């Protein structure tokens, strides 16, 4: 998150009126508390999955410019987090089929599963 | 008894065939019949479920069991979907359409 927040909420942007809403089931440690306290006016964290559509109803996913799904740089199996992010794309497009999603993958042969979805 | 016979060695062994054996494979299987090539192609459209029940049971002893109706059948405009839903125990009021795949329990000839 830090690099993404450093190169997203940067001083030299034009007209940033956009409030980042993180949504993740694991509660953060103290370092992320210190990081979210630094960006108080732009960042809101929430706890919960992106598979329960009630949790998507809490973050107002129905109306948002876009939803970005991040991915870990490392893992035991890349087909774990690849297919998990494909699952998250399936869920978010199942809720509201007119949203832009900018995701991440870890392989190239797992990215063909995103053309699988008709939405 | 077959739970016991599988319980003896954790395997499904077998042997020869008797007139007791081939008399045991007369159970009633589960199947799904069309409404085009069948006998009741006349009863295919506008036939009530009850008449199909009786004319199937009194002729073939096939227990009519449910109607597997196509989803975009009650709609007026022709769609292209082939997903069909399941209706269990239809009463006399239930109008039949010719493009169904009626669930029935079939006997063994």
């Amino acid at each position: 998150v830090s690099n993404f927040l450093k190169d997203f909420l940067h001083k030299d942007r034009d007209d940033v009126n956009v409030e980042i809403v993180f949504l993740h089931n694991i509660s953060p440690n103290l370092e992320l508390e210190a990081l979210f306290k630094r960006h108080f006016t732009q960042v809101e964290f929430y706890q919960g999955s992106v598979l329960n559509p009630h949790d998507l109803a809490r973050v107002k996913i129905e109306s948002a410019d876009a939803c970005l799904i991040l991915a870990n740089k490392y893992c035991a199996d890349p087909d774990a987090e690849d297919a998990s992010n494909i699952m998250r794309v399936i869920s978010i497009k199942n809720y509201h089929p007119k949203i832009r999603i900018i995701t991440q993958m870890l392989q190239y042969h797992n990215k063909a599963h995103l053309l699988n979805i008709p939405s | 008894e077959l739970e016991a016979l599988i319980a003896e060695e954790n395997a499904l062994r077998g042997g020869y065939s008797t007139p007791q054996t081939l008399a045991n494979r007369d159970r009633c299987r589960v199947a799904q019949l069309a409404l085009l090539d069948g006998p009741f192609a006349d009863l295919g459209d506008g036939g009530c479920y009850g008449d199909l029940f009786c004319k199937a049971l009194k002729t073939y002893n096939m227990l009519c069991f449910g109607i597997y109706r196509l989803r975009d059948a009650h709609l007026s405009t022709p769609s292209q979907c082939t997903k069909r839903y399941v209706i269990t125990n239809p009463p006399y009021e239930f109008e039949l359409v010719p493009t169904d795949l009626i669930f029935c329990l079939m006997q063994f000839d």
Partner: protein
């Protein structure tokens, strides 16, 4: 004796033994029905019970087949079964799928041919419970690999079963089912 009835209510089936020719010959209304007015050639074909198709116990190298080998034989009408099973993954008991699909209430030509698709090094760990049934096949591939499904004649095929062998590993809850949903969509595309 007992009868097993499909109804809509328990009072509909309380009716079901209140019957007499005299008391209830000519009543067509169910509410009217409910009156307690009664005054009162030695080839091994089947198994020992004779209820399942039983062939001879064969070797697993017979019913193994490559991608191009199944691509040669057109085998329409069949039933494929996908398995996401690793070697360390827990058992499923695929035998209980083959028994009621080889149930001897069907004729021998009437049967549906089963082709499993998955890791051969999983199916060898369960094949000692399935090695008695007449026609069956193994495809040593991956259900996500689309070329095996092209070679398995999925388009000209009966319902294809997707079963997740590795239910054992559980990440979150829904993520446990990720492989099955991912496969089904891939088959649809």
């Amino acid at each position: 004796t007992l009868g097993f009835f499909i109804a809509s209510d328990a009072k509909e089936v309380k009716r079901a033994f209140f019957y007499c020719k005299a008391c209830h010959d000519d009543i067509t209304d169910p509410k009217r029905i409910k009156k307690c007015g009664c005054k009162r050639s030695n080839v091994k074909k089947y198994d020992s019970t004779g209820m399942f198709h039983w062939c001879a116990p064969k070797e697993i190298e017979k019913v193994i087949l490559t991608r191009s080998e199944a691509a040669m034989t057109v085998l329409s009408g069949h039933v494929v079964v996908c398995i996401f099973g690793d070697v360390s993954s827990a058992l499923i008991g695929l035998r209980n799928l083959v028994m009621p699909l080889r149930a001897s209430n069907f004729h021998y030509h009437e049967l549906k041919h089963i082709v499993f698709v998955g890791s051969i090094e999983y199916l060898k760990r369960e094949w000692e419970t399935l090695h008695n049934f007449p026609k069956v096949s193994i495809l040593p591939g991956t259900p996500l690999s689309r070329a095996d499904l092209r070679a398995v004649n999925i388009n000209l095929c009966d319902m294809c079963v997707i079963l997740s062998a590795n239910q054992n590993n559980i990440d979150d809850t829904s993520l446990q089912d990720k492989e099955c949903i991912l496969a089904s969509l891939n088959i649809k595309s």
